[PDB]
């Protein structure tokens, strides 16, 4: 087949470059692992609905999503989520549940080592 080229979006290319630098700078394997998952082919990119965050995460959890966060199900928990991108329904459901939505570069700046961060795919 046409072998995997990687993303054509430059915003995704820079974020992939950003995470690899943050992994090297901080010796945090979470950023390198997130970079590998973000760089996957478009037909297998990670997507998560907010309903799944009810199960895999509890209140006070800081969650990084290596892809898109979709708005599905109902979120009854307070969680800090960082995503590659968030739909308007997912952002509203996260905020009104008491959580807060972060960009991935913002989470690295706030938490350089990524200690206690839970990856959700």
């Amino acid at each position: 087949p046409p072998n995997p080229t990687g993303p054509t979006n430059r915003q995704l290319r820079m974020l992939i470059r950003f995470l690899r630098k943050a992994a090297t700078a901080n010796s945090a394997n979470i950023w390198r692992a997130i970079a590998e998952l973000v760089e996957r082919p478009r037909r297998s990119r990670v997507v998560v609905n907010v309903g799944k965050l009810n199960r895999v995460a509890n209140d006070g959890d800081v969650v990084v999503i290596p892809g898109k966060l979709l708005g599905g199900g109902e979120l009854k928990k307070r969680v800090v989520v960082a995503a590659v991108s968030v739909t308007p329904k997912a952002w509203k459901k996260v905020v009104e549940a008491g959580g807060e939505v972060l960009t991935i570069p913002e989470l690295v700046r706030r938490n350089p080592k990524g200690s206690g961060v839970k990856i959700v795919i």
């Binding site: 046409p2 080229t5 054509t8 109902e74």
Partner: protein, 152 residues
């Protein structure tokens, strides 16, 4: 979006064009016949890999009858867990009219004809549906609501 060069660009100079030298590019005899043929004689091994053993059912044979679509109902069920999302969405738009002190939802006006029992109901609500499953009526009851069955 990414663009790729055609295989014909690569095949100029290759004599056989990817078809081989021994088994070259021939007419429909190179396929085993024209169209979807040979599945009982020489492509029977393909039926034995996908269809049922012995009969080769989905490729060949009859099974049952079809109830006519002009006298049967097209069903548009919705689970109560999904129905919980819809009432919240309608509640914020001011569409739902509060009449008995609970919220009242008319399934037919929404476009659904049946109520199913998947998910959770967390609010008291009145649902008009010509058909509601057993677990669906229970879960609406547990949330304080009721199901009213309306005949067509």
């Amino acid at each position: 979006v990414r663009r790729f060069k055609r295989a014909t660009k690569y095949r100029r100079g290759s004599r056989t064009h990817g078809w081989g030298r021994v088994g070259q590019h021939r007419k429909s005899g190179g396929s085993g016949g024209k169209g979807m043929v040979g599945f009982h004689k020489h492509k029977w091994s393909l039926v034995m890999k996908y269809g049922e053993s012995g009969t080769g059912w989905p490729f060949y044979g009859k099974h049952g009858f079809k109830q006519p679509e002009t006298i049967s109902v097209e069903w548009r069920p919705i689970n109560v867990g999904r129905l919980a999302e819809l009432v919240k969405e309608l509640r914020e738009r001011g569409e739902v009219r509060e009449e008995e002190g609970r919220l009242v939802v008319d399934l037919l006006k929404l476009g659904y004809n049946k109520l199913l029992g998947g998910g959770h109901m967390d609010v008291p609500l009145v649902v008009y549906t010509p058909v509601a499953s057993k677990a669906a009526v229970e879960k609406i009851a547990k949330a304080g609501g009721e199901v009213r069955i309306v005949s067509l």
